[PDB]
Design a protein around this ligand. Structure first.
Ligand SMILES: *[C@@H]1C(=O)N[C@@](O)(CC/C=C\C/C=C/C)[C@H]1O
Length: 266
């Protein structure tokens, strides 16, 4: 299955696209849907079973999500995405505008098309967050190799593949230097692999095309979402941009965000 219901309803459906990962710093769509209008039915995107995302490009990710919606027979009233998930949200919304008589609304939250920079920064934060499970040695070497990779590999797909190599090697080193359990380590390295696969495929989406009709919801974190862009570039990229004085990591749990989103969906 490619979708998980996270809030019930009678009615048109809301899809929410994100990489589900307990332990990340950022609030999640569960935090937003808790604060939306009751009766809003919401499904959250599931990743392919661990390992089966090997061999999937962006087209395959989107078709997998889209075919399950087609099979369900349900109509989609809105597609939400957060961060890199906004890329896939936009593509699904464009495809549903073509397959449905009436187009869904598209709302993207701090939308990002992954770059070598965002990939590398997220890699560093994953490693730091897991320094205790990996041990100081495997974590130190992972950062050293990842920095070297970021210095030498200029493209997103290639950097992602190398960072996954590095992280996999760190997990395997932790099982033989820091006493990390072997099945927890396979899960850890497989989950990071799935995350990078998702990010690299998200980067392949034509985000200029698919965000042209999006309403963007923006935090105040200057490195997040549309915030690094020139003002004229932001206005050209999306149809509308609402701003909120909250951190990126709090955006989806903020009551003001939820109030505005409920009105966008009404
Ligand atoms: C951008 C995105 O696509 N997901 C994020 O929540 C980042 C998740 C990245 C890393 C988890 C790092 C944990 C220490 C959003 O920022």
């Amino acid at each position: 299955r490619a979708w998980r219901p996270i809030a019930g309803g009678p009615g048109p459906l809301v899809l929410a696209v994100d990489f589900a990962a307990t332990g990340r710093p950022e609030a999640a769509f569960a935090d937003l849907v808790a604060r939306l209008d009751p009766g809003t039915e919401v499904w959250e995107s599931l990743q392919p079973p661990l390992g089966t995302e090997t061999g999937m490009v962006a087209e395959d990710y989107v078709t997998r999500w889209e075919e399950e919606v087609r099979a369900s027979g349900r109509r989609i009233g809105a597609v939400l995405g957060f961060c890199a998930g906004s890329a896939f949200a936009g593509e699904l919304a464009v495809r549903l505008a073509r397959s449905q008589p009436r187009s869904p609304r598209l709302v993207v939250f701090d939308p990002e098309s992954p770059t070598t920079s965002t990939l590398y920064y997220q890699f560093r934060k994953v490693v730091e967050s897991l320094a205790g499970v990996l041990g100081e040695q495997a974590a130190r070497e992972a950062l050293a190799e990842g920095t070297a990779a970021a210095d030498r590999i200029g493209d997103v797909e290639g950097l992602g593949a190398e960072l996954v190599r590095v992280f996999t090697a760190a997990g395997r080193a932790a099982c033989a230097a820091a006493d990390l359990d072997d099945e927890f380590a396979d899960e850890l390295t497989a989950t990071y692999r799935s995350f990078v696969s998702y990010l690299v495929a998200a980067a392949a989406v034509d985000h200029v095309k698919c965000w042209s009709g999006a309403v963007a919801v923006s935090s105040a974190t200057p490195t997040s979402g549309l915030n690094p862009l020139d003002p004229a570039a932001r206005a050209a990229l999306v149809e509308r941009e609402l701003t909120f004085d909250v951190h990126h990591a709090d955006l989806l749990r903020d009551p003001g965000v939820a109030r505005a989103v409920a009105r966008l969906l009404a």
